[PDB]
């Protein structure tokens, strides 16, 4: 088993650095002082009080229309558009159309298959193909709400001449108290936590040692903890209930890190076999906690917008990057950074999962999605662990971190550490509270 992993020699290697990574001892004060963890949300009062337990198509339709209409209403105000024309109304003069990008087939989107599906309010949900030959720049993906300008003389095709750019949400405006927070160190890690050939969770034990040594203020651990895709889980070869193995994993971490004084924040994954398989997911259920542990452990949902010492964190365990990246089409020149484009889409579509339809096997309850998977504000930090290579990019003023997985196959993975401290109030506003980030090898 885990032979390869335990014999690794890269241990501790810093593979990526962001900010003033040097000038900070990657040590937290442990449990010391004021640590304020608040879960954020997007209120809502549009949804009815009688829900069925299996989605009705008319309900999904409703959520998708509102997605278009709601964002379109904001974009229209921002770009001072005067009027949206119905997609099927032919005109000789240029028109401004609002709709959702889509593909005309079940395949990958390409510069010839783009279609624009209109909102119900203006176009009764009609679709029209879009010609991109005259479009100089564009980045599109299925599900993307956009405002396009072009010529549609017959009413059966839009020759796009302009694609308005996405507009992000404002950042969280800190209160005065938030400026009174001391520096905090946050560790981030995502599963799997065991190599693909063993169930020894050696990487997990190593990560626990790290937490105790560095004693970070907060640890955000993303699932899977008991991976549904692990060979031994899938073949039902295990000799204990899934729920029990899961609790043990949690126990090991909660107990094994008691001395560090770090606050643990557990985020579920759609791959956690024992847990609800539909997205968005509710928090894990774990009651076996002392009253001390209860002040040290937190179970949040997936996705989750979390405030840590005034700093807003966008958290998702779902591989949105890999999913969106596989379906996006672009065109400019070639000096473009793919991931920055994808991250820009996440920050401009205001959702933790804008891709629609979703990757095939991602189950989404759209009515829940509407209520719990929207972005409340443009986060200060976005943690999007992916199968893609680890990285740390600043996109639209948001530090986006992909700490990668802790384990990749039979080889060791990586995790990440951030240093935070919200700066002094005045000056050209945006002063990222995130001072430095590092992606380290486990």
């Amino acid at each position: 088993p885990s032979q390869k992993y335990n014999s690794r020699s890269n241990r501790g290697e810093v593979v990526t650095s962001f900010g003033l990574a040097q000038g900070v001892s990657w040590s937290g004060r442990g449990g010391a002082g004021n640590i304020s963890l608040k879960v954020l949300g997007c209120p809502e009062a549009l949804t009815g009080s009688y829900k069925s337990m299996f989605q009705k198509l008319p309900d999904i339709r409703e959520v998708l229309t509102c997605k278009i209409e709601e964002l379109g209403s904001e974009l229209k105000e921002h770009y001072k558009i005067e009027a949206f024309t119905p997609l099927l109304a032919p005109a000789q003069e240029p028109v401004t159309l609002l709709g959702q990008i889509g593909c005309d087939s079940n395949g990958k989107l390409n510069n010839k298959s783009v279609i624009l599906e209109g909102d119900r309010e203006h176009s009764s949900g009609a679709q029209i193909p879009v010609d991109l030959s005259e479009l100089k720049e564009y980045s599109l993906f299925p599900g993307q709400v956009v405002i396009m300008e072009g010529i549609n003389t017959t009413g059966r095709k839009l020759v796009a001449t302009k694609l308005y750019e996405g507009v992000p949400l404002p950042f969280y405006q800190p209160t005065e108290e938030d400026a009174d927070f001391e520096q905090s160190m946050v560790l981030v890690a995502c599963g799997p936590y065991t190599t693909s050939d063993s169930i020894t969770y050696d990487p997990l034990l190593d990560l626990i040692a790290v937490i105790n040594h560095d004693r970070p203020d907060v640890c955000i651990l993303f699932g899977p903890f008991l991976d549904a895709k692990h060979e031994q889980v899938e073949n039902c070869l295990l000799t204990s209930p899934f729920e029990d193995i899961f609790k043990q994993c949690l126990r090991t971490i909660i107990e094994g890190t008691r001395s560090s004084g770090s606050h643990l924040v557990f985020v579920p994954s759609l791959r956690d076999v024992h847990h609800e398989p539909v997205y968005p997911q509710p928090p894990f259920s774990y009651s076996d906690l002392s009253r001390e542990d209860k002040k040290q452990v937190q179970f949040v949902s997936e996705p989750c917008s979390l405030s840590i010492n005034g700093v807003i964190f966008g958290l998702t365990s779902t591989d949105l990057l890999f999913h969106l990246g596989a379906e996006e089409i672009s065109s400019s020149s070639g000096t473009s950074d793919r991931f920055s484009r994808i991250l820009k889409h996440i920050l401009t579509q205001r959702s933790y999962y804008p891709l629609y339809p979703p990757q095939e096997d991602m189950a989404i309850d759209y009515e829940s999605f509407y209520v719990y998977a929207q972005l409340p504000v443009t986060p200060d930090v976005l943690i999007i662990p992916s199968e893609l290579r680890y990285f740390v990019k600043d996109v639209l003023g948001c530090v986006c971190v992909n700490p990668g997985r802790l384990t990749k196959g039979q080889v060791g993975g990586t995790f990440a550490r951030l240093y935070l401290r919200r700066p002094a109030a005045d000056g050209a506003e945006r002063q990222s509270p995130c001072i430095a980030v590092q992606v380290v090898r486990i």
Binding site: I60, L64, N106, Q127, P277, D361, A363
Partner: protein, 173 residues
């Protein structure tokens, strides 16, 4: 009628942790009248003397695996056109609805129907609950003698617990 209600449902399959042969379950009981034994009493492989009742843990884990599969199948949202000449298949729900539902974007005169309906999923879950509802399979016996001889022979308080457990594996999700 229970036989027809669960006629199209997928049967619960789980391989013997010992001999390896795939056992199939469709009812609490196996066989008829007098030689009726709880299906979970013996392996289907006659050269395996392991009792499935001994691997309740492995069965529960398998049910979870299966139940996930069905819920994910339902949520994939595959839609298929009702027009035999079209049969367009998509996972993209069109915002353009006709009087009876999504309008097929291929032919523009037919409605798209869910490939795996919510009623099929619900029936499937009810089936997985029915094949382990021992109390119910026993109340479906006319004579209290047939039942109690059986209740005394195989359904001890512990075995009844095992069945209740599997039967409720359904709501963990």
């Amino acid at each position: 009628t229970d036989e027809e209600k669960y006629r199209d449902c997928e049967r619960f399959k789980c391989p013997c942790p010992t001999c390896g042969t795939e056992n199939i379950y469709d009812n609490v009981f196996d066989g008829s009248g007098t030689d009726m034994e709880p299906s979970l009493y013996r392996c289907s492989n006659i050269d395996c003397k392991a009792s499935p009742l001994t691997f309740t843990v492995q069965l529960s884990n398998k049910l979870i695996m299966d139940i996930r599969r069905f819920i994910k199948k339902y949520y994939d949202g595959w839609l298929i056109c009702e027009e035999p000449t079209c049969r367009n298949r998509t996972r993209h729900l069109p915002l353009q609805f006709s009087r009876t539902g999504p309008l097929c974007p291929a032919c523009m005169k037919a409605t798209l129907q869910p490939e795996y309906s919510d009623k099929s999923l619900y029936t499937q879950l009810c089936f997985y609950r029915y094949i382990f509802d021992a109390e119910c399979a026993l109340e479906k016996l006319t004579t209290d003698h047939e039942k109690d001889k059986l209740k005394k022979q195989f359904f001890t308080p512990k075995v009844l617990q095992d069945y209740r457990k599997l039967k409720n594996t359904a709501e963990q999700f």
